[PDB]
Structures are given as C-alpha cells and as structure tokens.
Amino acid sequence: PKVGILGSGDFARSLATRLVGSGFKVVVGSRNPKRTARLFPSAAQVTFQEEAVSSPEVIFVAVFREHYSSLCSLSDQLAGKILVDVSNPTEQEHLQHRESNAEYLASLFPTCTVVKAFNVISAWTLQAGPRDGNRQVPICGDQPEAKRAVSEMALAMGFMPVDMGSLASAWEVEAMPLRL
Amino acid sequence: PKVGILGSGDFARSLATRLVGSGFKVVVGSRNPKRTARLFPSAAQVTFQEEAVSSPEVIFVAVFREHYSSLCSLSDQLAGKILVDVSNPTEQEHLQHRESNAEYLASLFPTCTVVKAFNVISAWTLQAGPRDGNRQVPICGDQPEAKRAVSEMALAMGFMPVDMGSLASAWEVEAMPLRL
C-alpha cells in the first residue's frame, strides 16, 4: 500500500497482478487510463500518470528506456521517491549505452533514488509463477533503505532478493539473462 | 458479447484478458467472485456460477476435468448452449481415460453442444501473444454452427482456427503438445 507502477504494457500489467495477489494496494499511471484499466486487474487503480505517482513511496518504472524522459514532467511529484528500474535491455542496447538504464534513470531524476530489480523475471513468472516460493531477484542501488523496501516487497511477492551492491552494479545486472 | 467463462484460474484469467482485448463482453463464473474479481481484468464481470452462465451463448469451461461434474447443478441454465472444452490433459490423464475430456463433458451436459478448442494455446500466449498475427487453433465437435461460432471468436482473438472434424477427433487433439 500503495505501490505505484508507471506503464500500461504486459510487464506493468503482470507486476500489478502479482502485487495485488500479494496483498499490496496498487496504483497504475497510464497515458490512456480508460483503455488501460479494462485489461488490468480490477483491484489495481489505473489512473493518469500525474495522479498515479503522487501517493506511493515506491514506483515501478515499467516503460522502455526510450520513454524514460517522457516522464520528466512528473519530477516535482516524484521528488524523494523510490524508482524501480525493471528494464531488460537487448544485448545491443546493453552494449550501445555506456551507462545502465538504471543509472540513466537516476540521472533523469536526481531527487529520487533508483533501485534495479526484476529485470531477470519474465512477465509470465510474475503472473503465474514463481510460484510463491524460491526465485532469485538480483537487486542493487546506492541507498540501503530503498533496497530493503524493494527486497521486502520481493519477499512478499514470493521472490528471493539477492543483493548485488551499489547502483554501479546495475550494468552487470542488466546483462543477466531473462528467465526463461 | 457476452461470452462466458467458468473458472477462476490462470487460464480463465488469460482467456478473459484476450477476449476483453478483442472487443468481447466477458462474464466469469466463480465460486468466490469477490476474491476472483480482484485479479481479473476490470472489463470482465466476475460473478457467481449460476448468474455467469445465464446470459452467454458460448461458455468456456476453464476448470480441470476432476471439477466438471461439480458444474452439474448449472444444467438447467446451460441447456442448449455451446460449451468449449479447453483442457490440456497430462500424458497420463490422456492415456487413463478412454474418452476425451471433451466427450466426457458432452456426456455430462447432453442438452449442450461441445467444442474442443484452445488446448494447445498457453495462458501467456492468450495474455501476450499470439500476437494478433496467426497461430493455429485446432477445433472440433459435432455441430457446424457451434464450431463456426468458436472459430469466429478465435479469429477475432488473432488466432487461426483449424478444423479437425467431429468431436470424436477430440482425443487426438487432446494429445497435441502445448505451445509456448
């Protein structure tokens, strides 16, 4: 309660399903909430981006890297919040960009704290799996409190968080293969 | 409009999502609609079994074979309706039972007409895939009008129905491997 999600896609929608099933209150920020709401779990509140980010302490950024900067107008509402970078870049993206997606996201929102998590977990594993016991999510980032909040949430969702250290480890974590 | 689904599980929930995304009005019958509704797409109307099966012409039976007979008290409401058997039996189940699940279901509800379809399609393919591009659903059963109704529905969902003939083909169709 309340956990935030920015995005409207398969991953957003699977995250929301897992969070709702794990007893969290979920608020989703979408550009087209009317259309997006129809497919999302009823227990999730799908709303406009600016309204979705205002309440939660932890916000999953479930959009592609190319659309990160499109969230910049939310900066004032997001200040001091935890942002979770869940992105699973392609091999080419990984090698093309000097910084990790997580670090790029941190640079866009310097008043937020970024945690890398959930990139190795498939959308269907969120929906169906993992199952409520046993499957490892690598976590990093620069703030201990933020990492613990996301780790506890990972635990509540049935995953097993694995601390990979500071946000500088996000690049290596982003190379880890999607399972499976 | 309206298409019915009996059951509460990952497959039910994925079917509902695909149908809603394809412009159908969906009604779900669950024993625990309050709890079940929370995870289902918002556009689906989740309700009690008896109420769920009263309005639709086509009802997807998305429960395990062992629970088919538990639906017998719905017989009066289900009379003359099309039932879709989507079950994907294990190899052991397939070999253990002389008749196909679809034929078993037909035996339980003689005033209904059964169509075998969707057993080869994974829950994630329903959620995410197939894409809206092709991929092949085997269909059979004994009534041409019923098969056409389910085929149009398959097409609207972005699948490609493949006629496998009468319901006596269901056993062979039930042996077909599940596709990711």
UniProtKB/Swiss-Prot annotation, chains A, B:
The protein's induction, as recorded, is: By p53/TP53.
According to the record, which residues of the full protein are present here? Answer: 29 to 208 of 488
- Give compartment(s): Endosome membrane
- Organism placement in taxonomy: Eukaryota, Metazoa, Chordata, Craniata, Vertebrata
The family annotation for this protein states: Belongs to the STEAP family.
Give the source species. Homo sapiens (Human)
Which residues face the membrane's Cytoplasmic side?
1-179
Q: How is it modified after translation?
A: Proteolytically cleaved by RHBDL4/RHBDD1. RHBDL4/RHBDD1-induced cleavage occurs at multiple sites in a glycosylation-independent manner. Glycosylated.
- Which amino acids does the record list as binding NADP(+)? 8-11, 30-31, 63-70, 88, 123
Q: What does this protein do?
A: Integral membrane protein that functions as a NADPH-dependent ferric-chelate reductase, using NADPH from one side of the membrane to reduce a Fe(3+) chelate that is bound on the other side of the membrane. Mediates sequential transmembrane electron transfer from NADPH to FAD and onto heme, and finally to the Fe(3+) chelate. Can also reduce Cu(2+) to Cu(1+). Mediates efficient transferrin-dependent iron uptake in erythroid cells. May play a role downstream of p53/TP53 to interface apoptosis and cell cycle progression.
Q: Where does FAD bind?
A: 124, 132
- Protein name, entry field: Metalloreductase STEAP3
In its UniProt record, what illness is this protein linked to?
Anemia, hypochromic microcytic, with iron overload 2: A hematologic disease characterized by abnormal hemoglobin content in the erythrocytes which are reduced in size, severe anemia, erythropoietic hyperplasia of bone marrow, massive hepatic iron deposition, and hepatosplenomegaly.
Quaternary structure note: Homodimer. Interacts with BNIP3L, MYT1, RHBDL4/RHBDD1 and TCTP.
Q: What tissue specificity does the UniProt entry give?
A: Expressed in adult bone marrow, placenta, liver, skeletal muscle and pancreas. Down-regulated in hepatocellular carcinoma.
